[PDB]
From a paper:
Numerous genetic and biochemical studies have shown that PV 2CATPase is implicated in series of events in virus life-cycle, from uncoating, cellular membrane rearrangement and assembly of membranous replication complexes, viral RNA synthesis to morphogenesis. PV 2CATPase has only 329 residues but is very rich in features. It can be divided into an N-terminal domain, a central ATPase domain and a C-terminal domain.
We report here the crystal structure of a soluble fragment of PV 2CATPase containing the complete ATPase and the C-terminal domains to a resolution limit of 2.55Å. It belonged to the space group of P21 and contained 6 copies of 2C per asymmetric unit (ASU). The ATPase domain contains a five-stranded parallel β-sheet (β1-β5) surrounded by three α-helices (α1-α3). Walker A motif is located on the loop connecting β1 and α1, forming the phosphate binding loop (P-loop). A phosphate group was found occupying the P-loop. The cysteine-rich motif folds into a CCCC type zinc finger. The zinc ion is coordinated by four cysteine ligands, C269, C272, C281 and C286. We found that the C-terminal helix mediates self-oligomerization of PV 2CATPase via a specific interaction between 2C-2C, which is essential to ATPase activity. We compared the PV 2C-2C conformation with multiple EV71 2C-2C conformations, which demonstrated that PV 2C-2C conformation resembles EV71 2C-2C conformation-2, a catalytically nonproductive conformation.
Numbering used by the authors:
A (entry chain C): 118 to 179, 184 to 207, 209 to 223, 239 to 325
B (entry chain E): 116 to 180, 184 to 224, 235 to 329
C (entry chain D): 117 to 224, 235 to 328
D (entry chain B): 117 to 226, 236 to 329
Amino acid sequence: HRIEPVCLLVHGSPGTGKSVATNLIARAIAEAENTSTYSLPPDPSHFDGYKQQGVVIMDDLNGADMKLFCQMVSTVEFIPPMASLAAGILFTSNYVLASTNARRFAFDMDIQVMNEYSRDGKLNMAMATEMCKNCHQPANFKRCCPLVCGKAIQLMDKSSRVRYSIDQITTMIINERNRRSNIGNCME
Amino acid sequence: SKHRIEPVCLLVHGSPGTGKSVATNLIARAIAEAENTSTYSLPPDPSHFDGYKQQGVVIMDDLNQGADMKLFCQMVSTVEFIPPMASLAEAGILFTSNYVLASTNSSDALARRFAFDMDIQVMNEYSRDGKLNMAMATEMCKNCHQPANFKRCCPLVCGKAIQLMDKSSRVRYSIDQITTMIINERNRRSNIGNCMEALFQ
Amino acid sequence: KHRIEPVCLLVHGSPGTGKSVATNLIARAIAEAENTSTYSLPPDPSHFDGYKQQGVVIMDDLNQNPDGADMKLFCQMVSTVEFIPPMASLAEAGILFTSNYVLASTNSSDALARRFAFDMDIQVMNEYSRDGKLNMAMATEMCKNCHQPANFKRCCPLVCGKAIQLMDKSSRVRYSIDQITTMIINERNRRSNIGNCMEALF
Amino acid sequence: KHRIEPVCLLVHGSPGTGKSVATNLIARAIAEAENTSTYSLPPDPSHFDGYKQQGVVIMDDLNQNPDGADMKLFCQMVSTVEFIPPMASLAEAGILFTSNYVLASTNSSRDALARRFAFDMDIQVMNEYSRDGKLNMAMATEMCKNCHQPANFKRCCPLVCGKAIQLMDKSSRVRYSIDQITTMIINERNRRSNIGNCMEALFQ
Ligand SMILES: [Zn+2]
Ligand SMILES: [Zn+2]
Ligand SMILES: [Zn+2]
Ligand SMILES: [Zn+2]
């Protein structure tokens, strides 16, 4: 009976800051869904630490990966395997976020280090994590910085072709999780 | 990375007619109005927090001092807690409750968790047949002085009908009293917490 | 060879006078200066579960009946002689008590009285007392115009002596948390300068 | 969980091939770069005497003794939890471990411990500087004559610029000189610390 988790992945070259992207997005929707974030390690088979957190992030997806993923983004009741048998909890996460190098991905997006923050083609993290000094307040973040507002990095949808900021991308994922929850409500 | 202040914990012991539920619930609607929240009550022998929307107070009843108590240790803590839900459309909410009140009638590392270990005691004028004369105890109070955590007073508020007695010290408190005692140990840990955060961070 | 005797502080106070926060500020400050952490014993300390040789130890509500246990423990902690605390866990049995500071508060022969390098009464300043209770809310407000504290990054009335002070039960002189906290560190350092030199000489 | 995981380097090599020389070179340059000192643990170490929260710690011959002593300490250090190391001198006990770099050499083949090596590398002596299979130290310490300035050392020698020894990342198989991998390690630590400060601020 469970609903299908909204899903995002982020293709990137290694120095472009896609780990900090997903994590910023995860922590934000988490803050809003009064939940927490579960990280899967790369190449992971067990869910030591899962406790039905509202959002999980999958560092460096992809192949058991493309399998254990498709159990996660499904309507089937699914039971993750454990390390300590201390087993049994359903997987209920309403969001899955992940990174790498087809309809289960409501948000298929490539990244772009903006040029004033490129450093040899790589994201200049020291500069990209300085706080923004002339910005409107973000929609899902307390405060603004260049990773949130689109200065340092942006997400390009392949299909849409459009470019959004992180702040925009989180507003978008929320809404789709709500739609899905809103219909999943009325029916029931 | 521990991030939440452990909640202040009250446990009232007592024989089953003694008002022991009525006390845990009088205190809780008092605190809740003070911090402008709501209450959320757990069933006896409970496993699921369905309907827990991070309201400020949690009531446990019939705590068996133990499934009752394994789950109790996890609420009263600093470490993040994720209540199990039966509904899938809810599972995922973080436990951020400040108070847990529990009642009972009935190993030192768990004891410290009981910030207030009281014994409910029914005063004789309000005890017909050996149990709370609830019709008496609820009648409003005529010349009582204004309570601290209630806008009006009655013989449960003011210790006329019902009083609870610290198991360890042995002194007696009314309901209206032990509320601020609890409100304040919660205000206490808040202000000390912020204070230290600001001096060493 | 042997361990130096932990410099020890005892704060006497009535219940709402803030002697726990007093001892906690002092500990955190000493521990920050010593590059350490703090370890709190629960009242009625039975076990030292979680103790990993944090240089600073806190005993909240010490009962000072010399027949009591609080004081029998206390006399092993505050001594020069190997003391291997009891752990409830046997997966934790064997670590030595090496802490250099012990900070305790209570409500109130000479061999227990030597152990207290500093024996002190806490005093609410009246401007912060709700019927002789520490008005914690306004005492934990940050100060706005204090000089930089000796041992705290920022100042507040709990630190500089606006809200609370500590009176020496002997000399009858009063001290802020900040002042007592450098006397306590100076004392441990004097013990250590002496102990370390005794070692080099032999 | 208040401290940041130290950045961690593991250099595998046979026993004459200069891996000790190479971790000490990296350590010393990282240390200058942060105005700290280095602290060296002995092989199969028990005690941390002399540890004063120097920023770079060094371990050699890790897991040489396969008993476990090496790997418990290692894992306590490459962690996010408070670690109060063991000392032989009682005077010295209780200091907190807070180094940001752990540099280890080994001769072994060692999920959640691999997670701790941010750089897992094999040392390879280039043939011109090999002598009977081991690193020719006397040749390698002669200063380079015509080399661009190195990023992390004041002058260049073949140990630095990749002439004498190289470091091959076991995963990717890419090779790096010492100077390069120093900038990489420094840059990982700064990144960790920049992301950290940002997350605190945004969820502050
Ligand atoms: Zn901005
Ligand atoms: Zn009344
Ligand atoms: Zn001040
Ligand atoms: Zn060179």
